[PDB]
Point group: C3
Chain length 155, copies 3
Amino acid sequence: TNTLQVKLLSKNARMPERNHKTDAGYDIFSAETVVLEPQEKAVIKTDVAVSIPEGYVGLLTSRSGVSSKTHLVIETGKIDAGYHGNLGINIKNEHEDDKMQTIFLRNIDNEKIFEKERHLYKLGSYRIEKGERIAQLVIVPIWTPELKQVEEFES
Amino acid sequence: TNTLQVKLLSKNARMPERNHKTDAGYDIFSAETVVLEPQEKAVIKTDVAVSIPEGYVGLLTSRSGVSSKTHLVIETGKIDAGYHGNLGINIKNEHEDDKMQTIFLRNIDNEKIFEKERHLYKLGSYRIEKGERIAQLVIVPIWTPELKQVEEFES
Amino acid sequence: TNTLQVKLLSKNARMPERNHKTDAGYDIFSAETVVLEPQEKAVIKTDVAVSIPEGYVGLLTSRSGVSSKTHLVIETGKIDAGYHGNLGINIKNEHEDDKMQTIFLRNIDNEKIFEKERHLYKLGSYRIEKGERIAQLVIVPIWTPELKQVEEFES
Ligand SMILES: O=c1ccn([C@H]2C[C@H](O)[C@@H](COP(=O)(O)NP(=O)(O)OP(=O)(O)O)O2)c(=O)[nH]1
Ligand SMILES: O=c1ccn([C@H]2C[C@H](O)[C@@H](COP(=O)(O)NP(=O)(O)OP(=O)(O)O)O2)c(=O)[nH]1
Ligand SMILES: O=c1ccn([C@H]2C[C@H](O)[C@@H](COP(=O)(O)NP(=O)(O)OP(=O)(O)O)O2)c(=O)[nH]1
Ligand SMILES: [Mg+2]
Ligand SMILES: [Mg+2]
Ligand SMILES: [Mg+2]
């Protein structure tokens, strides 16, 4: 106990990292560079697996920085105990498609990505680089009792 | 203890079911067949009540399959201890209204619903059938202390 | 133990309040009157700080009433232990921008705000008043072990 196993599935993966000693969440990094157009969905790969013990659940969830600044919305993922597969970050660019163009992609701090080669993108598009802090994993204990069907409650 | 009471409110309701032994969430089924147009909201009825004991909270939340494949977004519901009412799934079709038509509704796996009778729908519309796994209930313990107002923290 | 410190940062702030004895969440009030146009984002200030102890995490999250009735979407905030700063409610008006006008703002119950002075707003705009129940704080215990890297899991 007091030990969580972590299995890196690739060279692109990075070990989960906790910001402070007091903090609750382990920050999670992307294993791939992805461009998301307005309204576009994706399951961004972490290339990290973990073995959550029985009587616990992981919460692969958004960071307040990224979610407040940008229209990148991560749907909180309920990481089951025993799931040793690749942790996917369930993400959607929730910026509106207003049929407008721009030479600037946007980073995860909602800042213009300057670049030498000029390219037209859809306005509201974002780019997430390889190995950026876009999510965090918070583990909490769970209650998994037997279900007893009843006609009325005892209270 | 180690027992959760479940009260079926209708013939349309189904008993909550856990997928595996190791898993954290009890999968929840719809009690009604619903069509959601783009941007349309609803509180889909489960027709299941539960008695969560004191010192716990239920999390009626999305499944990673349905949320990744489709624009159906369930807002996680905080199920209080003692709430013996009908569990509503708080859902919105977050697909954009782009003023386009199609003969195909979409199922919860983002697949075309073929049908003999031809009908025009709005593009991005979904249909959820009676008794489909669209949500899951994860129960976690909670901390409910007394609040003491202070001018500064003791740390 | 069984005591949470709460520090009001302003006269506009209100003490967090639990609805019932059995309930899990402490309801949180806005410290500022804010108008959110369609698609507009904000970090609405509570002007309340709290000292969550070690081995716990706060969940600053939406209420089922406000989220079901309106397109106001609060992204659940993961409140770390030791964070003594101002609690921001991470909110976005997820109503579509359909380029239409109206004389009516909308309140957090999705009801028309009548007013003597006539003003044109964008359709789907909301207003949140000073000191309205728009969020709730649920505290849960957490598991914060050491991470051990491994080539394969022990199971
Ligand atoms: O965001 C997520 C969510 C889940 N997952 C993984 C972890 C979890 O153990 C597994 C199953 O989660 P769900 O039960 O919520 N998905 P679903 O019920 O649709 O599929 P399954 O049939 O596997 O339960 O998917 C992710 O990688 N990312
Ligand atoms: O998605 C949900 C969320 C909540 N609920 C139920 C369970 C819970 O016990 C009850 C109250 O939850 P909230 O406190 O979050 N809603 P609100 O604070 O707006 O209303 P109330 O005055 O009842 O607290 O609503 C659902 O059925 N589905
Ligand atoms: O909705 C929120 C979410 C977080 N917070 C505060 C509480 C928490 O202690 C602090 C940090 O939360 P995150 O770790 O999720 N944000 P991020 O990882 O982007 O920044 P940091 O570098 O501070 O970790 O922000 C809010 O006030 N409102
Ligand atoms: Mg962090
Ligand atoms: Mg499942
Ligand atoms: Mg409440």
